[PDB]
Amino acid sequence: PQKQIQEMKEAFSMIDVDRDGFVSKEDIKAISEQLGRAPDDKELTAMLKEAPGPLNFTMFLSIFSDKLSGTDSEETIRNAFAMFDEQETKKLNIEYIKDLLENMGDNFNKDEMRMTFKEAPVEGGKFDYVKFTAMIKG
Amino acid sequence: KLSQDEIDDLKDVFELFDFWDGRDGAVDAFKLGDVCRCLGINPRNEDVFAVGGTHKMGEKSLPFEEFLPAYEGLMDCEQGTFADYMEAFKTFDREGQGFISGAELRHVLTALGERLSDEDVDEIIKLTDLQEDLEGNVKYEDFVKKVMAGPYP
Amino acid sequence: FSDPDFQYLAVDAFDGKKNCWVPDEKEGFASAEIQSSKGDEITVKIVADSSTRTVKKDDIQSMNPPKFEKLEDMANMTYLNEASVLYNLRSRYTSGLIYTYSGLFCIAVNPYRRLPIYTDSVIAKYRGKRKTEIPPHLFSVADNAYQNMVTDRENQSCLITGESGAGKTENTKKVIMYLAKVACAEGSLEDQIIQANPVLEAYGNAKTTRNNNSSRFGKFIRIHFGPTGKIAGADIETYLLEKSRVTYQQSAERNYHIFYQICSNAIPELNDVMLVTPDSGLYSFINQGCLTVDNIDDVEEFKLCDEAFDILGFTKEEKQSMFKCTASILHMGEMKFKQAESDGTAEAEKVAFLCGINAGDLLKALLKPKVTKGQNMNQVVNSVGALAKSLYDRMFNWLVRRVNKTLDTKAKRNYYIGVLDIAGFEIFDFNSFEQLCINYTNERLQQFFNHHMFILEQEEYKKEGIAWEFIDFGMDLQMCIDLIEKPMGILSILEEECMFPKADDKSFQDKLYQNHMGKNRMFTKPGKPTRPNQGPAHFELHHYAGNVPYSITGWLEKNKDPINENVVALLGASKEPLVAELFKAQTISAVHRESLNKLMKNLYSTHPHFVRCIIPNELKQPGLVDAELVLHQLQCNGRKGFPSRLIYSEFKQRYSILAPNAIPDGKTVSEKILAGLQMDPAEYRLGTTKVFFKAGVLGNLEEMRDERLSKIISMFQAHIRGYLIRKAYKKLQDQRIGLSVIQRNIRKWLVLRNWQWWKLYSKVKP
Ligand SMILES: Nc1ncnc2c1ncn2[C@@H]1O[C@H](COP(=O)(O)OP(=O)(O)O)[C@@H](O)[C@H]1O
Ligand SMILES: [Ca+2]
Ligand SMILES: [Mg+2]
């Protein structure tokens, strides 16, 4: 990506407080607190151990990219959806989708179920999988 | 007794199903019909229950171990030839000229023998694209041939 | 031929798949044209009013093409079903034609009006004509029996059957009148014969609701022929005369015809000879029910009856002996009463007078019959009736013996032609001894009719070269016959029960169960009502044509005649010469036994010809039909055991669906079907044009016919179930993937939000 990167950097900048081009336990703890509650030592510790050596803007983009890897397109997903949208209305009836995910294929769980719909864009009975495919993607 | 490429086929399909009713290596005995209906065969409901099928979902699930013999079973069961379907349909033709009316055909399917929901009917009608003439009659010979043909001929 | 002689004798748009016969309530059957099938619910249109309705498919009857309108012989019709037959008859009937053949059976439908078809003009034309040569007629049946007896050299016989008021008698007479007019060699033999009816009918017929001239006795008359084929003698046999009508007559009914003739004044000279006042409504014994009779002139009938006694060759005394004994009866019922004493003597003398016995010695042996034993007030009035009835019975019997005297010309006899005019099976609200007698009679007749039907049967098992062997027949018939006639039978029990003065309606009833309850399955305790007003029943008999609940009350006197053995002594030595003979020097059942056997060995020595009479309606009016009644008669005329027969054409169409994986000619297709089914060569037979299935088998084929047809229908539904499933199989693989995308790709975005790094990242974002 190129705009995904532009952010990453500017981000790494705001995170790398002691502006030393590296991210340290104090760097993370620092900025977190300046905003919302921050992680405990143990959280911060294993949070760094996730990166072999020093956190230059490189090992950074490395672990972040290796996260977002192993996923499909916004087009590839929007279709796996329209695959249940026979009439091609660009919406799925809420009871339907919930039913699919819940007890079909690789059954979800109530939490997976709640976590998922806590965000979901459902209004008028129909769950718009387009808007939701975007939200979940780009 | 089945062959390998055969048993493999049972395997193939068993998955598509066992997955859809929640993947876990077990299939709802209420689907054992449709499973075999996919491997070509068309048993009769009377037929399926005989081997293990059930009237409702939830009732019970089955492994692939118990599944093998249900298919060994539903194999040795009688399939209807063209002769038979032609014979039976003749008994509703007073004219004798291979006709019948939509309305009556509908009656035969929905009302006689192991009934067929009103939906499956409008279904297959539309599928096979069966059409009536001005008098509202249809050549039952054509119809039987399509149904026999398959969804993809 | 425009010929006047054939006026009421000669017969003056159709889709074979649309047009048919559909049941009706008014007409019995209606002309319908099918509109739409629907499984079993056929929807037809009534051609008449043009209305519409539905009808079970198995209730439609096949119609015949206009090709067979008013057909003379019904065996030549395509369809012979209760609706084709009823239509053909009714068609002819409403056009004057009342005679129609159907195989070897002639059908006569009562005209209820006089027809110019019996004239001498017409008889001339039927002489020596072969049934197909000339229109259907009773003469033809008679003329043919003659030719057969002649050429075939054997006795002939006509059993003219039908319901009461149908035409049995009228037709029996026309047959004799016919045979008399073409085989003819006081008056002449031929003349006396014809003349025996007027006297026998006067003494043994009576107005009934059903028939204004109901025959109340069975008649079998044989007509002998000589070496030149001409009438050379004749005899008459009678059976079971209704003794009861003499003293009793249900409303709207009359007593025998004579009694009313006698009180009309046709011959005033006789009034003083009989001591009668020309008023019928004066005598109790004959004014209970009816008095007059629409279309019966008692005046003229009396004259003709008198006239007939002369031609029969009856001395004036003889025929005055008759008239007096019967007028005597008229008085026996005028004797009033009050142990009992008389209430006058005027009427009781006229009686002693006419019978040539002392009025004193009479009322004496009547009020204290002799060792003496007085009688009460009813024991008497009932022995009065016992006497009236018993006299009249003897009279009727002597009368016949005498008319045979006149006819048994000692001339030379070769063969003969009998004619049978008897009442058939009848089941009423209440059935007693009278009925058992008629029924027992009809049973033995049945065996006869069967024996013959079975012979024509085999005439078929050869017209197609399909010889059958030992079947299973009339065992139930013989079971009933035996239950009634054999050594310890019903009648034999009753006969041995009469000879005991001690006996009664209960020792007889018990003595019956004692012998057949559980030892013979035809004898069964009285069941439950199958008709309102169903009077008492003590037991039931399973007769060929029905189950009859018999009440045995009074059967002991019915069979033995309970008249003062005292008065039988008085009359034994009476002055009148007739009366003396009647009570000169073996009960109903016993006489009838010997009688029936006589008629049977007779009949079994003949080649029978059957005529079937049919009453068109209950109104006695001409040309009007009552389909229900008609149909009802057609029901079971001229079954039960004979193999099933099927034309390969109709067989293939109905039983192909039982082995269609063996059907690539109607006669070979079936050869295949029945072959496929691995059907036992036993349970069936070949045939040129038709298949013969042993008994029951066809019922069982309709079994398999229903089962297989259901399966096959299921199998095609299974086929439809499997097609729809497999059709949606692609849609089920694509969705299996399209779901795994979403399921695995949401679990990702789910776990990425539960990432410290991502969390904190998302936070910085702005
Ligand atoms: N061939 C006929 N022609 C004219 N009238 C007839 C004929 N046959 C029967 N009838 C009428 O119907 C009545 C009953 O006929 P009949 O022979 O006495 O009946 P059953 O079958 O009881 O002997 C007759 O009195 C007569 O009025
Ligand atoms: Ca499963
Ligand atoms: Mg730093």
Ligand SMILES: [Mg+2]
């Ligand atoms: Mg009669």
